[PDB]
C-alpha cells in the first residue's frame, strides 16, 4: 500500500479520460458491423458448410474499427500529440495491435473461454474459420487466459496499454530519448499501483509477470502480421491494419 504522487494521480485521470471516451465501451458497438447470426445465438457454431465470407467481412470490419478507436484514443493525449508524426506512426505501427488485445481481454470469459462483446460471443473456431492458422489461435488464446487470470483493476489495465504504446525500441522512433523516459515514467507509475493492492487476491510479482506479457504481446504483434498476409486477400480487406503491419 504505497503512494501515488500528485503527477501519477493526474496521469491515470487522463488515460481513462481518453480510454472511456473511445475504447472499453466500444465492444458493445461490434453488433453494428453486420454480425453473422450464429454470433448472437452462441448455442452453436457456423454451420459446417455455410458461407464464411459473411463473418470475415465482419472480422476485418471490427478490426479496422478497433484500430480506429485505439487511434482516437492516442489523440486525446497531450504527450502523444506532442510527439512528431514520424513517431506517432512508428508508435502506432508498433503498439496498435498489442493495445487491442490488452483492451479485448476485459471481455474474455474465463469459464467459457469466449469473448463476450455485449450480445455477441466470439469463440476459438470462429477465428479458425476466418483462416488463422491453429497455433496462432492456440497461442493467442493462452495469452488471454493468462492475462485475465491476473485480475487487473481497470486502471491496472490502462497503464499496461500505455506501456505497450510508449516503447522507444520500436523501429522508426526519432525522439528515443523522450519516449525512453516516457517508458521509464509509465513503468514506474504502475509499479506504485501494484504495491498499493487493497485486496490481495492477485500475485506478488504481478508487474514482473506483466512484462513477460508485454514481451508476449511483441511475439503476438509479429505473428499476427504474418497471419493477415498468409491469408488470401484478407490483408486487403482492412487497409488500415495493413499499414500498422507494414
Amino acid at each position: 500500500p504505497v503512494q501515488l504522487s500528485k503527477e501519477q494521480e493526474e496521469l491515470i485521470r487522463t488515460l481513462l479520460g481518453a480510454h472511456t471516451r473511445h475504447m472499453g465501451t466500444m465492444f458493445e458497438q461490434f453488433v453494428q458491423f453486420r454480425p453473422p447470426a450464429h454470433l448472437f445465438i452462441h448455442h452453436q457454431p457456423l454451420p459446417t458448410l455455410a458461407p464464411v465470407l459473411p463473418l470475415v467481412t465482419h472480422f476485418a470490419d471490427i478490426n479496422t474499427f478497433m484500430v480506429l478507436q485505439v487511434i482516437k484514443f492516442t489523440k486525446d493525449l497531450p504527450v502523444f500529440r506532442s510527439l512528431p508524426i514520424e513517431d506517432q506512426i512508428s508508435l502506432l505501427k508498433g503498439a496498435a495491435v498489442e493495445i487491442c488485445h490488452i483492451v479485448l481481454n476485459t471481455t474474455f470469459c474465463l469459464q467459457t473461454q469466449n469473448f463476450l462483446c455485449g450480445p455477441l460471443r466470439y469463440t476459438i473456431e470462429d477465428g479458425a474459420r476466418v483462416g488463422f492458422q491453429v497455433e496462432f489461435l492456440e497461442l493467442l488464446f493462452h495469452f488471454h487466459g493468462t492475462l485475465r487470470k491476473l485480475q487487473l483493476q481497470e486502471p491496472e489495465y490502462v497503464l499496461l496499454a500505455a506501456m505497450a504504446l510508449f516503447s522507444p525500441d520500436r523501429p522508426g522512433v526519432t525522439q528515443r530519448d523522450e519516449i525512453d523516459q516516457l517508458q521509464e515514467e509509465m513503468a514506474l507509475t504502475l509499479q506504485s499501483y501494484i504495491k498499493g493492492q487493497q485486496r490481495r487476491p492477485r500475485d506478488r510479482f504481478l508487474y514482473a509477470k506483466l512484462l513477460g506479457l508485454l514481451a508476449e504481446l511483441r511475439s503476438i504483434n509479429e505473428a499476427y502480421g504474418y497471419q493477415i498476409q498468409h491469408i488470401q486477400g484478407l490483408s486487403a480487406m482492412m487497409p488500415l491494419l495493413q499499414e500498422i503491419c507494414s
Binding site: K75, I85, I89, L92, P239, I244, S246
Partner: peptide, 12 residues
C-alpha cells in the same frame, strides 16, 4: 507511404 495513418493522425 502510410497514407491513411498520416490522414488519420491529422486532426480531430
Amino acid at each position: 507511404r502510410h497514407k491513411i495513418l498520416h490522414r488519420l493522425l491529422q486532426e480531430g
